[PDB]
């Protein structure tokens, strides 16, 4: 008769704040490789075959190739660094995060 | 008759704050490789075959190849570093995180 | 008759704050390899075969290859480091995390 | 009374065929020095000083300086030689060198 | 009365065929020094001082300096030689060297 | 009365065929020094001092300096030699060297 359903996710697939805010840096003297393979995927595959069929679910993924067949440095590779990324991060306090769930029955 | 269902995730698949906020750095003198293989995947595969069928669920993944067939450094690879990443992080206090779950029955 | 279900996860698959906030660094003199294989995966596979079928659930994973067939350093690989990552982290106190679960029956 | 003086050198200073006919060769791959210091000198110094004098006989000689403050070869110094100086020397015979000294007295 | 003087050198200083016909060769791969210090000198010094004098007979000689303050070969110094100096020397015979000294007295 | 003087050198200083016909060779792979210090000198010094004088007979000689303050070979010094100096020397015979000294007295 009476159905009260407070609910947030029923049949769901959630990625939240997921793979973010990351400082990648690369300061080489020379001849160097940095690879940051960072996908954020969300799949939902439902492949119902019937009675004689053929489902070939083959989506394929990332390929990263780096080749360097010849490479020479015939003198001084030099790199002087005073500093990187002089960051000052001063946030102010006094913030409020309020989540209220009121569920009241009466007669 | 009376059904009160306070609930947050029923049939769910959640990634939250998941694989984030990471400082990757790379300061080589030279001839160096950094690989950070960092995917954040979420799959939900439901492959119902029928009675004679063939399901070939083959999505494939990441490939990272780095080849370097010849590489020479015929003099001084030198790297002087004073500092990296001079970070000051001063947040203010006095914050509030309030989660209230009120569920009241009456007659 | 009366069903009160306070509940947070029913049939769920949760990753939270899961694989994050990690400072990776790499300061080589030269000729060096760093690999941080850090995926955060969440799968949910339900493969119901029928009566003669063939399910081949083969998603494949990460491959990281690094080859270096020849590599020479014919002089001084030198690296002087004063400091890395001079971090000051001063958060203020006086914060509140309040989780209230009130469940009251009356007549 | 009778003076017969057959003679060839009385007060003499002779150099003959003296420092000649010499094949100097130099086939370097690179960065090489050949010095052939080959003077042929003939001096005759007669310095008669008198009673308070000063004779400073200082003629000075050869100076050969070769300086090379910096020198680099940053790749393959290669030199393939099939042959040098293919010389055929066929003189014919039947030559005559006749030196006759006849000194005859009669009355 | 009768003086017959057959003679060839009275007060003499002779160098003959003296320091000649010499094949000097130099085939380096690289970075090499050959010095052939080959003077042929003939001096005759007669320094008669008188009664208070000063004779300073200081003619000086050869100086050969070779300096190489820095020198680098950063790859293959290679030298393949098939042959040097393929010489064929075929002189014909039947030559004559005749030196006749006839000194005859009669009355 | 009668003086017959057959004679060849009275007060003489002779160098003959003296320091000649010498094959010097130098085939280095690299970084090598050959020095052939080969002077052929002939002096005749007659320094007659008188009664208070000073004779300083100081002619000086050869100096050969070779300096190499730094020298590097950062790869293969290689030298393949098939042959050097393929010499064939075929002189013909039947030569004559005749030295005749006839000294005859009669009345």
Swiss-Prot record, chains A, B, C, D, E, F:
UniProt modified residues of type N6,N6-dimethyllysine: 38
Glycan-carrying positions: 7-8, 74, 80, 96
Compartment(s) of residence: Cytoplasm, Cytosol; Cell membrane; Cytoplasm, Cytoskeleton; Cell projection, Axon
Cross-link (Glycyl lysine isopeptide (Lys-Gly) (interchain with G-Cter in ubiquitin)): 8, 25, 38, 44, 48, 58, 70, 74, 80, 96, 102
Residues annotated with Phosphoserine modification: 12, 20, 32, 51, 79, 83
Disulfide bonds: 18-49
N6-acetyllysine, modified sites: 8, 17, 25, 38, 44, 48, 58, 70, 74, 96
Organs and tissues of expression: Expressed in neurons. Isoform PNS-tau is expressed in the peripheral nervous system while the others are expressed in the central nervous system.
Region (Microtubule-binding domain): 1-95
Omega-N-methylarginine modified-residue sites: 76
PTM sites of type Deamidated asparagine: 6
Site (Not glycated): 1, 17, 21, 25, 38, 44, 48, 58, 67, 70, 97, 102
PTM entry text: Phosphorylation at serine and threonine residues in S-P or T-P motifs by proline-directed protein kinases (PDPK1, CDK1, CDK5, GSK3, MAPK) (only 2-3 sites per protein in interphase, seven-fold increase in mitosis, and in the form associated with paired helical filaments (PHF-tau)), and at serine residues in K-X-G-S motifs by MAP/microtubule affinity-regulating kinase (MARK1, MARK2, MARK3 or MARK4), causing detachment from microtubules, and their disassembly. Phosphorylation decreases with age. Polyubiquitinated. Requires functional TRAF6 and may provoke SQSTM1-dependent degradation by the proteasome. PHF-tau can be modified by three different forms of polyubiquitination. 'Lys-48'-linked polyubiquitination is the major form, 'Lys-6'-linked and 'Lys-11'-linked polyubiquitination also occur.
General function of this protein: Promotes microtubule assembly and stability, and might be involved in the establishment and maintenance of neuronal polarity. The C-terminus binds axonal microtubules while the N-terminus binds neural plasma membrane components, suggesting that tau functions as a linker protein between both. Axonal polarity is predetermined by TAU/MAPT localization (in the neuronal cell) in the domain of the cell body defined by the centrosome. The short isoforms allow plasticity of the cytoskeleton whereas the longer isoforms may preferentially play a role in its stabilization.
Entry note about domains: The tau/MAP repeat binds to tubulin. Type I isoforms contain 3 repeats while type II isoforms contain 4 repeats.
Disease listed for this protein: In Alzheimer disease, the neuronal cytoskeleton in the brain is progressively disrupted and replaced by tangles of paired helical filaments (PHF) and straight filaments, mainly composed of hyperphosphorylated forms of TAU (PHF-TAU or AD P-TAU). O-GlcNAcylation is greatly reduced in Alzheimer disease brain cerebral cortex leading to an increase in TAU/MAPT phosphorylations.
Name used for this protein in its record: Microtubule-associated protein tau
Protein's organism: Homo sapiens (Human)
């Amino acid at each position: 008769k009476v159905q009260i359903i407070n609910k947030k996710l029923d049949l769901s697939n959630v990625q939240s704040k997921c793979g973010s805010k990351d400082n990648i840096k690369h300061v080489p003297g020379g001849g160097s490789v940095q690879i940051v393979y960072k996908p954020v995927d969300l799949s939902k595959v439902t492949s119902k075959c019937g009675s004689l069929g053929n489902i070939h679910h083959k989506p394929g993924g990332g390929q990263v190739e780096v080749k360097s067949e010849k490479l020479d440095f015939k003198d001084r590779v030099q790199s002087k660094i005073g500093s990187l990324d002089n960051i000052t991060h001063v946030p102010g306090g006094g913030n409020k995060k309020i989540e209220t769930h009121k569920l009241t029955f009466r007669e």
